[PDB]
Design a protein around this ligand. Structure first.
Ligand SMILES: Cc1cc2nc3c(=O)[nH]c(=O)nc-3n(C[C@H](O)[C@H](O)[C@H](O)COP(=O)(O)O)c2cc1C
Ligand code: SF4
Ligand code: FES
Ligand SMILES: [Cl-]
Ligand code: NA
Ligand code: NA
Ligand code: NA
Ligand code: NA
Ligand code: NA
Lengths: 417, 155
């Protein structure tokens, strides 16, 4: 079974949960999964009522791993309060710069994800589930299709799964190059065969979603926790890591570190610990200048001792850690972030459309040294006016990292003016 | 304009796969580019029909998704990431090696219509930066000698 070639992303874990198998860079098929006790949580769950599963996932304190951190149990409860049919969607668009964690669970432990989807679908009474995977992940698509066929041959999918009365089919859909299709509402739009335009909220997907029906969209990693919760029980799971943010957390570390890769760690872990204790310190032992929290935030070297949690003075985001050392031009890097937002705005909202283009256009001029004084004052203006009238989060944050970079590295910007 | 039957089969298969048939528009478009080495403009009228969809809907979809190309036919698309992480780790070294080897820059096809360099945003492999794909296969760039061996696999 040949799949397309994949770089072997390094992976390390201290909890031995989501990365139990995925820390080795190869496809774990169903036989090997069954030997580690795979699909036994499914069997367990099918002898409990859907309600009981909702309650367990709620009591676990599992929060979403796609960014918002919304309680998964509450989201499921909201959806079941609305009459069916109901749909279950696995968000695998992972297109944010610096994020490569979801792909390793998909390419290495697909049956962990499939097992979670089946349990979760049964909890919300969904008989149709979708995995929406970005189109630049062709290998993960083909691996998922083969794994679904395996689970079906073993009686984990189809009609009347293991004599339970539950029917489930999992459809695998692909993207075609659009970061915005990771926003849950634009994903549903893409799933409907349309352009990936975010819908206005409310309504939220749990009331009106796919074909207007109650729809739960969950991230790959949120779903991958569900088998563990069923297997260990809610009380045991909730004691993992910090109380405020329980469970295994996945940190994608890239840039100027010696051991770039995915790390499974508790969230009480510090930013310095991630870089130095786990990721092998900086490359060449150069001093750290800044950490880019994906394309969302910019932390300086005077903020390395912060908990990697969702707290006041926390790191937040999706815990994405891109390291920049002393020799790296952060206005050259700021331009790179600008250019991301320029290529990814869907265009619906005027300030986002125009502001994302103009931020990148002008910063290029500033970088190349051909910006007039009016180009400078306009850059500043455009940067603080991408947000207005926007109906999704991309507009809200397109100027954010860059604004922090102006506030935290003024000396480096003055060099360009 | 009609598709070869070889190709119509695959498209019917995608269209039967999902519950409603219009959900298969991206898989049909992927399959057409795969087969022709681009999306021919003349291909979109018969696709729209199989999907029971108006032409201008399909036009807006092709235009929205960045993987699809209607300008240039190319056997092997070399997708080169230009986002923050790969920039830091040597996108410019990769593009230079590509220029030395293939004689082309981003957005150009080779004169034999074999390779097109396509600048793309983050490819979700940033730990192995700088990253590039050759159609579905994906790699880290280490050096020009290494790149040259990889490209020599694609005949
Ligand atoms: C522009 C944008 C991109 C997003 N990309 C992703 C993504 O790649 N994956 C993801 O799970 N959530 C992404 N989200 C968040 C989703 O809309 C949604 O909150 C999430 O899929 C819910 O699942 P969760 O409860 O498991 O976190 C994105 C949001 C925005 C505004
Ligand atoms: S804020 Fe930007 S990306 Fe979001 S819907 Fe509006 S135009 Fe599209
Ligand atoms: S920045 Fe190039 S793959 Fe992520
Ligand atoms: Cl959101
Ligand atoms: Na077996
Ligand atoms: Na399948
Ligand atoms: Na994308
Ligand atoms: Na990729
Ligand atoms: Na290497």
């Amino acid at each position: 079974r040949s799949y397309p070639a994949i770089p072997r992303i390094y992976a390390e874990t201290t909890l031995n949960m989501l990365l139990k198998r995925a820390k080795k860079p190869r496809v774990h098929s169903i036989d090997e999964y069954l030997k580690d006790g795979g699909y036994q949580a499914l069997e367990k769950a099918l002898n409990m009522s859907p309600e009981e599963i909702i309650d367990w996932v709620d009591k676990s304190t599992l929060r979403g791993r796609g960014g918002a951190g919304f309680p998964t149990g509450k989201k499921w409860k909201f959806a079941v309060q609305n009459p069916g049919p109901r749909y279950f969607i696995c968000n695998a668009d992972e297109s944010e710069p610096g994020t490569f964690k979801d792909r390793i669970i998909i390419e290495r432990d697909p049956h962990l994800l499939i097992e979670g989807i089946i349990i979760s679908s049964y909890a919300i009474g969904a008989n149709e589930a979708y995995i929406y995977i970005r189109g630049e992940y062709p290998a993960g698509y083909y691996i998922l299709r083969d794994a679904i066929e395996e689970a079906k041959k073993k009686g984990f999918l189809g009609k009347n799964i293991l004599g339970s009365g539950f029917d489930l089919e999992i459809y695998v859909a692909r993207g075609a190059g659009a970061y915005i299709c990771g926003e849950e509402t634009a994903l549903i739009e893409s799933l409907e065969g349309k352009r990936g335009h975010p819908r206005l909220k409310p309504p939220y997907p749990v009331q009106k979603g796919l074909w207007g029906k109650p729809t739960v969209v969950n991230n790959v990693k949120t779903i991958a926790n569900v088998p563990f919760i069923i297997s260990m029980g809610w009380e045991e799971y909730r004691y993992i890591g910090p109380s405020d943010y329980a469970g295994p957390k996945l940190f994608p570390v890239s840039g100027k570190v010696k051991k770039p890769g995915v790390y499974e760690l508790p969230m009480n872990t510090t930013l310095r610990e991630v870089i130095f204790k786990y990721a092998g310190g900086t490359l060449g032992n150069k001093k750290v200048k800044a950490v880019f929290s994906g394309a969302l935030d910019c932390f300086s070297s005077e903020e390395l001792d912060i908990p990697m949690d969702y707290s006041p003075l926390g790191f937040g985001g999706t815990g994405t850690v891109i390291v920049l050392t002393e020799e790296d031009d952060i206005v050259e890097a700021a331009l790179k972030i600008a250019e991301f937002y320029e290529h990814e705005t869907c265009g619906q909202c005027t300030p986002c459309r125009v502001g994302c283009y103009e931020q990148a256009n002008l910063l290029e001029k500033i970088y190349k040294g051909e910006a007039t004084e009016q180009d400078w004052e306009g850059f500043d203006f455009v940067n603080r006016n991408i947000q207005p009238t926007s109906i999704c989060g991309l507009g809200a944050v397109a100027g954010r990292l860059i604004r922090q970079t102006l506030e935290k590295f003024p000396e480096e910007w003055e060099k360009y003016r | 304009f009609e598709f070869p039957e070889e190709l119509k089969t695959k498209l019917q298969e995608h269209i039967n796969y999902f519950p409603k048939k219009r959900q298969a528009i991206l898989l049909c478009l992927h399959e057409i580019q795969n087969y022709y080495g681009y999306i021919p403009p003349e291909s979109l009228k018969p696709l729209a029909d199989m999907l029971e969809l108006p032409l201008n809907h399909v036009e807006g979809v092709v235009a929205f998704y960045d993987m699809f190309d209607r300008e240039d036919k190319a056997k092997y698309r070399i997708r080169v990431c230009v986002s923050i992480v790969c920039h830091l780790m040597g996108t410019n070294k990769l593009l230079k090696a590509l220029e030395n080897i293939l004689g082309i820059k981003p957005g150009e096809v080779t004169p034999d219509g074999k390779f097109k360099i396509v600048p793309v945003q983050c490819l979700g492999a940033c730990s192995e930066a700088p990253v590039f794909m050759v159609n579905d296969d994906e790699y880290k760039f280490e050096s020009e000698v290494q790149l040259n061996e990889i490209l020599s696999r694609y005949t």
